[model samples]
Target chain A: KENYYYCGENKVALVTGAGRGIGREIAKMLAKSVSHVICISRTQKSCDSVVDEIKSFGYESSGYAGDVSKKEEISEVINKILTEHKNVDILVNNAGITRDNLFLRMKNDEWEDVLRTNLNSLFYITQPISKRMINNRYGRIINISSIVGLTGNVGQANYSSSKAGVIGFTKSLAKELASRNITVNAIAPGFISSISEQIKKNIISNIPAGRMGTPEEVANLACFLSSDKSGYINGRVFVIDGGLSP
Target chain B: KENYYYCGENKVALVTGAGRGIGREIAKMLAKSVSHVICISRTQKSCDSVVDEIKSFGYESSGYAGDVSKKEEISEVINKILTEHKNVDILVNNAGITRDNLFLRMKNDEWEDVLRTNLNSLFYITQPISKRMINNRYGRIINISSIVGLTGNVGQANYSSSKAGVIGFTKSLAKELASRNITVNAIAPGFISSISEQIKKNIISNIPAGRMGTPEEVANLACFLSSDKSGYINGRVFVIDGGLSP
Candidate 1:
């Protein structure tokens, strides 16, 4: 087990789906402020690359490849991170998948895939981690949601349903964890700049902000949620889409 | 068909789930100004009895027996009313359910049942009613959502998802149908007076209002939402929970 230190204060952090997009940004941001980054994702190569990137930035991070959707893999990653770090202080459920399809044409596979990958993963990954936090009596669990879930989109029923499920899961978990110093919350980002260029254009035209937000904007909010500064906030779905969901 | 009218004239309104709670009160208050009333619920017995009671106060109203969850039932009932009364300028989607359960323990049946009954039922019942208003190019669709949906509740995973989904669906459909001049919106009622005594007592400690709000308070907002004055307000969810979720 490594003697992890966060902000030079020994607070450990674990981030899932650390390969790319908002997940990678969250990992990088947390690594800069926290100690012992558990860079988790499905591919060892992607995790290793992220770990290498963080290390080069003068941060302590380790790569651990594991699919959050699988219970065995999720438990394995948790056991490894907890065993190595001794006390995991932060857990980010950033792993998700989108299976876009209109409801009329949506197949069972499409629906199940999104639900299992996005919704189920939240549960599978959060359970063990939550138990560890509850035992220690402190933790921060932040789930990455989206504006698509907040405002239903055409041709994205599967994506919408799964993302919407994340809110449900977050609320229920927040209640169970609130008294234990574990704040379960979700961040719904809208029209992210990290999205495809085509999507970004549509977002600019639609979102009142008239432009997409960067990953750093989202990381800033995630960082606030991860720290003790936001102790009073719990079980909320904060929208970072310039009120797109509102 | 009787002559149709609008804007405080020919003031006839139909409110659902109006038996012993918010629905009943909406009917009563609207009856004060509207010439005719149509109160609907699952059982005709309770609704009819209320209609009889309110009719004695010089209010012209009839009881409609149907379940909003049943498309055929609601369609048939609405058809009968429109055929006889000619037009209904106001539609309120207050009929809802709350089958609270934690995520891990939530059954597939529980989740699907709540969504179908609460969220999809709004679409099923509102679409046809809204169509007539679209033809007339003037109407108000006010749905009753809840604070739990906006800020996840611990034991209400199914209910919260369905309610939040209702808000999302309301916005999307609002965008698609706004050009027609008919506005679709939702009211999120917080800890109100009409809730079960048990639940009321359990949560009254947290309500900032220092007391539960009366159904009449919610009815006032419903009345406001149903008026031509609210023409510009569309695709939004207004919280009446006394700052519970806000």
Candidate 2:
């Protein structure tokens, strides 16, 4: 925490898909410094579990069960959150779904579902929050894209398109809200071994680091993006894929 | 012609805003290798002047006057072009406009106008051409973005936002059409001294190269991106800022 110039401040941080994986780690790290951690997930049980973990560790946290893909429901939940928290200093659009298929075989639903969950949800959620941030004249939006978005992946056209859209949304919104002192950015993570041990080992050989990246690694970058130290780093996409992009 | 492997082989290349500056240079360079070069600009005189320049060297070229911002007009022109050329193998979306002002002082028209011309024009012009590329199972798209898009600038908020959106659109479309052998990429140029010598000198002091990039320099990179050699390099934003980004 001492190493972080912006962490551990009295800032309010809201993280979506915070129940597990990269989102969970991001929320945990932010909780170390943020005044309150609003943990949102599709399931109440998962959300509460993460919130409980934060609470047990002496951090202020609350759990909210809302599907980000459902714009109306998520909007309602965000309204309630704003009433309680007043303002969200940092918002992380980390929730995403992957429906991998060859382009020729990719169905309309496959494309629509991925776009709705990963890309369209950003418009649904960030629009209202950005307006409030403009009023407050402060905000940090960190979108979780993917390395595949930067480099096209076979059998992941829908996923890549959605993540790529996130990068575009991040840049567009960053410029729109920059004058209001809000910073928007995207992080593209490479092969994270958190999925499975066998897969991790297989990917390690290809990674430049010769190992899979941990969720905590991505969280560290997220924490920096959420801080004032990164104020000048708006509208940029940081690829944390260990130089595997080439 | 000897410099490019892909250009002289009966490949048809279409360059937008090809009257002067980087667009003119891109058309000039592509003419060396492409069998036919289609130059489009808002003014007939400017377009014909470029066509004459290309024709002077015994290269096949054609000129059209149309505003890309006007979707109906550009659409009709593109339809006419397809009727004659059969298909456009390469496309360079380089037409853009800048409206610089502080966000608070920027009016709705300023924002709307810039977005319409810079960002929306890509959709209008490329949508039809992209279909041909998809059907042909071969295509290259190179969008001219800016370094300001990568790192938002204060006064040029509108310009930065529009350029940044181009990056996003490039990546998304790259993924969507990659399996069909279509590649989409963006080039973010730092500063070109072609606008004014005084301004170029002032910018040169800031750039590490201690010199400004020529329109031909950017055109060289555009040529590379348009070639089959850059086949695997898809959905990436290449920065040609002379090491000034840091």
Candidate 3:
């Protein structure tokens, strides 16, 4: 009752790469508050299943299929969304892919592809929606970054650069839109359990908390950032990596 | 001898607000590596005294008196330094002030003063220095921020907003200059003993580390960030708070 305003009264949130992993969890948690969670992913089946899961939980959600890496497809899908929903109050730029390799051995395509899908897609998607947010004079833009972006990894040069680029983009946009009550922020998660068991064990030993963060923890943070309670926290990166990347 | 590169090969570092507190400590630490330290402060006596202290340690340093909040004063002082020294390899924008008051009661002057002193001063000071760095194709910029900036405090609305603004400036400049090998970042320090003893005690009790952080601890992180080893880490905000901030 105290937090009724945050728990959906017709707010619309769009989350990218919502097929599975951390993105799916964010979509599910936001469904509890937002009037509609437009879950987007490259595969139609993946987005449909997540949307179904949210609906089964007595929450509201919709599925959209489009490869976020493709600028034309995302632009078309977002246009349709605007036509149908009228506005996008919140945007979660969670779509990302990693092609990890040493810089010397990494291919040119690997770097370009990661930048296009992870960082550039943000521009393609946010430009159209942000115009609406600007007119409404209220918006929340949250970018999902990574811990490796803060502390460089040995074999993830391409992934690290793209993630770091997201942070820069988040800050610049945050400043540009602050006057309009639009908040832009980024979340850098450490070793999430969504990774392979072997990788989790390798990382858990290094984390001071002695465990990996659950997807739900990340979701809670994203939900908070999407709310008015976190309005003062503009142009910042919130690290939820269980004390791993200090 | 193992850390020869970081230890004095005629490198020059310019630190603003180096008369006292964290800025003073950072100036002291960098003196161990950088050959000459240009200490800037509003008061000539404060700058001279700190320069004397550094000289007492057998490290080279010079005092420059100027108000960072005054754009013309800062520009003139930086111009003089550029003439004396070929270039400044490092810059620490640690100068800041606070006028604490509740949001509604806060006056326009209070907000403007804080912004000019803390946030806008960065542009006044860094613009000339960054040009030299870009031409040199190398530089390290470390801006001292506050945990309040990351998590807005009740009475520190003005201060927090300015510090948070510093973070946004740091990220945006980092990306624009990364190609030139210039790394820019900000550090958010939690409660320090520099505050009043009563306030320090009150805040220390809440910190998980059981005490406030030492000025040297924050200085160490700044020195690390200023080094070439941290080249890959850019466009990021580092929290040096002792398990206090999320």
Candidate 4:
């Protein structure tokens, strides 16, 4: 997978939370870039279909199912890939959930679930894979955060806190592995919606961009964060919210 | 104190983290408004003298001593005030800590202590007082967060994470309590020195403001947030960081 630049071949990337939303598009783009893409998510059918599309495009592709929140499942998935492909150059943590309720009304389960899914998953996946990536000494870890993490939101307390914590976790891990030549960063998407059907026209007017961002817009940023071009940018939460918080 | 407003005066305020730095100047400006001021910090001797200096200007004042990180200690201090005065109308959550270390090298105590002081104290102190303020349907909770919270810093993973968590905590509480007419917001300061330290000729050179901010400048914004004039500004984080993150 290495030396794709001069060989006019391809690189290798593994995307988690890649069943749908921004993750889906990121896999598509990586396939377009002449890279082998391993699409990963809990949803198997969708991931299989997406990987099929990537393969049809004349690039290497495969689908793997693993819940990032579950440590054993993640470890097994990464181990299987390592045995088959030897290395994964890029790892993206994009899966997220929303448990919206007032603080007084929010249940303990809601809070714990979101934190485990969003923040802890980063650690469970990165800690081990990073060790292997260190052997190669070249890897990119992109964690998808959100704009609400930057400017806290009213109802989505659990979501905001977990995403905010992700930024913190990323920075800490970034510093830990910076010397090993791995870059860790986060993408905070603002007001981006892949489910345009669910968005109301009234709410659409409130967006400064006047429209929600496309999945491709988010994937583009993810692609850049994974590329060598973003070598100097590490431990940063890159906001893609169309100036909503600014 | 209730009905102290009947003395044809504005409501009183209790500002913690008020010994020096931003808190001290916040106290000074509140004194300028002639609100019966209570300045609090971990040390009584320092604030006792500050009380005298504040009294020199002919403003009623006193110093309360307690470390904000301890729940029982903070409750005991607030209980003392309830026994003597009516009730503090404005409560400022300003005390904070900086425990800077890479995440692995960081002690568990460092993370726990900062969260206790910065995030948990908000709930520990505000919960009881919030009920009282709900009876009157008027209250203001101004939290002092940091720019590093919005943008993660190099070696401040612990500090940044705690502050970032505070923003979510502030908004969740604000939304939960806004219907009852309580406003909760955070002020983020850049590299402002509360006292008049000669701007390091080097640091000042990079600042767009040409100098670090004064405590009075932060206090001015805190005053606005604490005032009835900002009734519509609940669940927001106002950046006073002079375009650093922008």
The numbered model that scores best in lDDT is: 2
Tens-digit lDDT track of model 2 for A35-130: 898999999999999999999999999989999878779879888888887688899999998887755555546755776688656655676677
Clashing pairs in 3: none
Candidate 4, DockQ to 2 decimals? 0.23
Which residue runs of candidate 4 sit more than 4 Å off their true CA positions? A1-88, A107-139, A164-185, A190-217, A228-246, B1-21, B24-88, B102-135, B168-181, B192-217, B230-246
* iRMSD for each candidate structure, in the order shown: 4.4, 5.6, 11.4, 3.5
What shift in Å separates residue A12 of candidate 4 from its native position after superposition?
5.3
Q: In terms of TM-score, which candidate is stronger, 1 or 2?
A: 1
Candidate scoring better on TM-score of 3 and 4: 4
Cα distance off (Å), candidate 3, residue B120 = 0.8
lDDT at residue B181 of model 4 (Cα atoms): 78
- What is candidate 1's lDDT per residue for A123-150, written digit by digit as tens? 5566667768788888888889888777
DockQ of each: 0.18, 0.11, 0.03, 0.23
Looking at every candidate separately, what fraction of the true A–B Cα contacts under 8 Å does it contain? 0.28, 0.07, 0.00, 0.35
Candidate 1 vs candidate 2, DockQ winner = 1
Q: Candidate 1 or 4, higher DockQ? A: 4
Clashes of each: 6, 4, 0, 1
Better of 3 and 4 by lDDT: 3
lDDT (Cα, tens digit) per residue for candidate 4, span B181-210 = 788888888888742344376667667877
What lDDT tens digits, residue by residue, belong to model 4 across residues A70-181?
Answer: 7678768878877887667788888778878766556556765776677656655665567677788777889888987766777666787677777876776687778878
The candidate with the higher DockQ, 1 or 3, is 1
In the range B1-246, model 2's lDDT, one tens digit per residue, is 335646425699999989999999999999988889999999899999999999999999999998987767987988889888878999999988888775545654675566567766776678778879889988888999888866766556567656766776687678788888989999999987554768666778889987778898899999998887789999889988788886
Per-residue CA lDDT of candidate 1, range B1-246, in tens? 322223467766788887778988888777877788889888999798879878989989998887876766786887888888766777777787776666546655676567657765654566567667767777777778788767767777667766776676566556656777878788888877645768767688677776878898888888877776778998788888775555
In candidate 4, residue B217 scores what lDDT? 83
